[PDB]
Structures are given as C-alpha cells and as structure tokens.
C-alpha cells in the first residue's frame, strides 16, 4: 500500500497518456513477447512518468442553435394549443350535441392534420432561424 497524488492521477487521466497507453498495449499484445513483456512495461512506465512530471511542471503556473430550436418549439406549440386555450369551443360543442359518427371521424382526422401542420410550421421556423444564425 502506498500514496498516489492527485496531480499524478490527473496527468495519468489526461487523454494523451491514455492514447499512449493504448498504443503500448497494442504493440505489446501484437508484436511483443512474454520474455520482454515486463521490460517493455517498465520502459513504458518510465517514459510515462517522465512525461507526466514534465506536463505537471509546465501546467503549474451550438448554444444559439439549441436556443433557437427550443424557442421555435415553444412558440409553435403555444400557437397550436391556443386552439384549446381560446375556450370558444362552445359553438362547436353546440353541434357536438348533434354530431354523427361521420362528423366525429372527421374531427378525429382533423386533430392529427392540425398536429402535422404545426410540425411543418415548426420545421420551417427552425430552418429560418438556422439561416438567420448562419447569416
């Protein structure tokens, strides 16, 4: 049991050292023998220790598109749901008392048609916003 320093841990977890470790493991497994396995491992350890010490020594001294997409979603869905929010559905309901099965099927289809229209509006808004952002 021994001590490991946080600086050593950070330098080991640097991606450069991880790539070096992967290359070393690949080389040892493919073009390396068992007789020299430990010797090669110690050489790699020494080189890695030196480079991490040097790295510590020298060290010691999209969002717009996402926001536009959420704004387009919020705005378009609010426009769609203002349908329900208007509360003016009473004059439709006066004849909802008097619908037929034909009419209720028509309303069922119209709901999905409105949803698809809102999706088209949302896609168009996203394209316009992306064009404005890149411009």
């Amino acid at each position: 049991y021994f001590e490991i320093s946080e600086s050593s841990r950070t330098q080991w977890e640097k991606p450069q050292v991880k790539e070096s470790k992967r290359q070393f493991i690949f080389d040892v497994v493919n073009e390396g023998g068992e007789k020299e396995k430990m010797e090669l491992f110690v050489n790699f350890c020494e080189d890695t220790i030196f480079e991490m010490q040097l790295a510590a020594q020298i060290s010691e001294s999209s969002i717009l598109t996402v926001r536009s997409a959420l704004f387009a979603l919020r705005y378009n869905i609010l426009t769609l749901m203002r349908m329900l929010s208007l509360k003016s559905l009473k004059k439709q309901m006066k004849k909802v008392k008097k619908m037929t099965v034909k009419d209720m099927v028509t309303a069922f289809f119209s709901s999905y048609w409105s949803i698809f229209m809102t999706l088209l509006h949302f896609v168009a808004s996203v394209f316009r916003g992306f064009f404005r952002i890149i411009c």
């Binding site: 959420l70 979603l73 749901m81 559905l89 999905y112 999706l119």
Partner: protein, 458 residues
C-alpha cells in the same frame, strides 16, 4: 354521450395501432404501382407538356386514384404511428429522466450542459402533475423527496418537482369535496395538463421516425402537384425490407472511413492539379479547332474540375484525356505524372473503397458468428460454461431453458411489477426492494443451484 365518444375514439386508436404495419406495406406497394405507371410517360410539344400515353386510356384515372390512395395511406400511417409507437418513446423518455433525477440529480446537484436539446427540454416535465404518465414508478417524486430533502432543502425540492405542500395537508386533514361530472366541457378542459402535453408534443416532434413519416406525407402531398415526387417514396425500401438492411450495412458500417477516403482522394487530386497547373499546361487543350483553344488548365478551379471530373472518371487516368507528350522536353516528367496518377488514384483509392465494403461484410459475419458461439457456449445469466452442465446429459440446454431463462426473468419482473406490494412474499419483497434500488446482486453470477448443491444432489 362522452362515454360513447371516448369509447369510439379508443376503438379508432386500437384499429390504427393494430394496422400500422400493414398500411406501411401498402404504401410501398402503391408507390411501386405509381412509379410503374410513370414509366410510360411521354413529353409533348417552347412550353413542354408532360402527357401519359395510353392505348387503353385507363392508366390516367388509375394514376389519379392511386395518388389519392397513397396520400390517404400516408396520413393513416402517421396516425398509426402516433397511436402505437409514440407511447413507447414517451415511456422510455420518462423512465430515463426519472432515473437521472433520482440516481444522478440531473436538475438538483448538476445541471444540463446547455447544448443538450433533450436535457434542456426535459425541464418542463418535472413540474407537471402527470409525470410518470406512462412509466410505472409513480413514487419517483417521493423518492427524490427522501433522497435530497434534507440536503438541498425540502422546500426547494418541492418547488422544483411541483409537489404542492397544500394538497397533501389538505387531504390529510378534514376537507370539503364537491364532485364534478365529466359531461362538463369546463371540467374536461380543466382536466387537461397543458404543460405535460406541450412536453409530449416536443418529444414527438424531435423524434426521428415521426419526422421521417412527416417527410413521407409531405412527399405524398407534393406528388399531386408534380407526379414525379412519388419517386422519392422508393427510398423507403431500406426500411421496408430487412434483407436489404444487411446489404446496406456493408456501406453504412464504414461510412465515416468511406467519406474520409473521398476527402483524401480530393486532396491528392488537388495536389496533382497544382503540379499540372504549375508545369503541364500546354497539354490541357481540349478543342480540335485550332483557331479557338479550349484551355482547361489556365484556371486553378477549372483545372481542378477537369482533374476531379474526367481524370477521376477516366479508366486510364488524366493521360487518357490530355495531350500526348511524345517528342517533348517534359516527356519523362509527364509520363511519371500520368503513371503515378493512375496508380495512386485509379488503382489504390478505389481499392481502398472496395476493401472497406468487403471488410464491413466480413466484420458483420464475424460478429454474428461470435454472438452465436457465445450464446451456445455460455449461459447468459450466470456465465458458466456449457461443459459443467453437460456433465449431465442435455444439462446445458435444461439449465438455459428451465433454470436461467431470460424470458423467465422478464416474466418474473412483469409479475412482480403487476403484483401489489402488500401481497408480496419474502423473496418477492427482497427482489422488489433490490430492483427499486437498482442493485443487481440478486442475479446469479458464477453460481447456480446445481453448483451450490453439488454434493447434496449427487
């Protein structure tokens, strides 16, 4: 009244959900019929008029009816998708966000990275009163309550998760309740949770398959204005037929390397174009008319277009299309230029592309073989090899079909979820608690009944 309309709505939902796939097949068949009809299509005498030639005279009405039918079936496919596959997407999203909230504190101890659309959008669903609408775990808010109440503030966690303190105390104490009958429009409108529906619609809009089906519908609608837009629906065969997927995987498996190979080819051709534009320009005349020379390499861009278009497409290379260099001072240099172009571009790079496709085939075959070998040699759950069980005749198959069946584990999880907590046995309560805490130690790993009772059994 309302009970009738809701029942008939549910019947329509069930019908479309049941017949979603059949309509998806029918759309492809109708698309093949329409595109077969469009193969007999003749342009007529300036303004050009496109007319469907027909000795029978009945292919035009057939085409009109087929276009209308395709447009209807495309809309029915969106309805069927929304009835059938949307609930699974919502269930998965609600389970993911709930587990991130509970076991990671995604909105309590950390925050979304401000570039994740999913993470930023999932803020809305937390405050809603209809959270796990599809997910089974209805006590996730109480779990977050218990886990982070003492640390990050009971009052703040309650505000974040939208649990009102007033309602709990109101129900616990004595209350006055007035029933509200469902016949009321005001009641049915108040019952709607607008925020949860907003979040659900956002998730559906951001779903990929729903976007593909919307593109299909848009193409179908545009087909009425121009009948040749129906040809885009032939691109649906990849999803329609699974046997086409194994062929397309040979390309999609190494797609990034395939694109980077084209980038490298474009760089190599640009270097060759630079060399030619600096030294070999007299050889790039492309006109037989002596008076007017069609100089193809007097411009960097024009010469690069020449090399990438005709140099690449030519079988022999750029020397197959540029002037013969015999009897010239730069004869040897130009010959080396052409030979190196042919070798590096025509031979090696195209071979790299072909090798990428072939290696994709081999990789897929090897992966399938490895899956089969692992499945036939070791048990999925415990991981013990087949030999130990095969010491008894048919032992491995008996073990994998009776003792450690993954289907049996799935059925046990379903039975434990559907069973009520009060009636749970001791073993069921143990497994239920351990599953709620997401600890998987109850799964046998490296051990089994026979291995524990080696000597007692035999």
């Amino acid at each position: 009244f309302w009970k009738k309309i809701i029942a008939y709505q549910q019947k329509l939902l069930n019908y479309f959900a049941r017949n979603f796939y059949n309509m998806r097949m029918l759309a492809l068949f109708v698309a093949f019929a329409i595109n077969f009809i469009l193969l007999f299509y003749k342009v007529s005498t300036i303004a050009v008029h496109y007319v469907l030639e027909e000795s029978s005279g009945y292919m035009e009405p057939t085409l009109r009816i087929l276009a209308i039918l395709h447009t209807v079936i495309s809309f029915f496919c969106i309805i069927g998708y929304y009835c059938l596959k949307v609930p699974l997407v919502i269930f998965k999203r609600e389970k993911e966000v709930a587990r991130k909230l509970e076991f990671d504190g995604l909105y309590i101890t950390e925050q979304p990275s401000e570039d994740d659309i999913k993470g930023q959008w999932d803020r809305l669903v937390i405050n809603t009163q209809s959270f796990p609408n599809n997910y089974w775990d209805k006590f996730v808010k109480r779990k977050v309550m218990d886990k982070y109440g003492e640390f990050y503030g009971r009052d703040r966690i309650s505000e974040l998760l939208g649990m009102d303190k007033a309602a709990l105390d109101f129900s616990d104490a004595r209350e006055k309740k007035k029933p509200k009958k469902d016949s009321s429009l005001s009641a049915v409108l108040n019952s709607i949770d607008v925020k949860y529906q907003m979040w659900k619609l956002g998730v559906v809009f951001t779903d990929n398959s729903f976007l593909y089906l919307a593109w299909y519908m848009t193409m179908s609608v545009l087909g009425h204005y121009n009948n040749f837009f129906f040809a885009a629906h032939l691109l649906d065969i990849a999803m329609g037929f699974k046997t086409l997927r194994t062929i397309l995987s040979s390309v999609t498996h190494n797609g990034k390397q395939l694109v980077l190979t084209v980038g490298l080819l474009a760089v190599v051709v640009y270097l060759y174009t630079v060399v030619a534009f600096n030294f070999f320009r007299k050889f790039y005349n492309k006109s037989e008319d002596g008076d007017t020379p069609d100089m193809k390499c007097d411009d960097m861009l024009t010469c690069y277009m020449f090399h990438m278009y005709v140099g690449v497409r030519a079988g022999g290379g750029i020397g197959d299309e540029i002037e013969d260099p015999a009897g010239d001072e730069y004869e040897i240099y130009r010959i080396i230029f052409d030979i190196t172009f042919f070798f590096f571009v025509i031979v090696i790079l195209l071979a790299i592309i072909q090798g990428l496709i072939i290696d994709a085939f081999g990789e897929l075959r090897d992966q399938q073989e490895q899956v089969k070998e692992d499945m036939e040699t070791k048990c999925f759950i415990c991981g013990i090899g087949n030999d130990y069980f095969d010491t008894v005749p048919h032992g491995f198959e008996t073990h994998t079909l009776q003792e450690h069946n993954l289907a049996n584990y799935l059925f046990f999880l379903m039975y434990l979820i559907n069973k009520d907590e009060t009636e749970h046995t001791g073993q069921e309560s143990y497994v239920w608690k351990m599953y709620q805490e997401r600890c998987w130690e109850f799964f046998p790993a490296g051990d089994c009944f026979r291995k524990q009772y080696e000597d007692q059994l035999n």
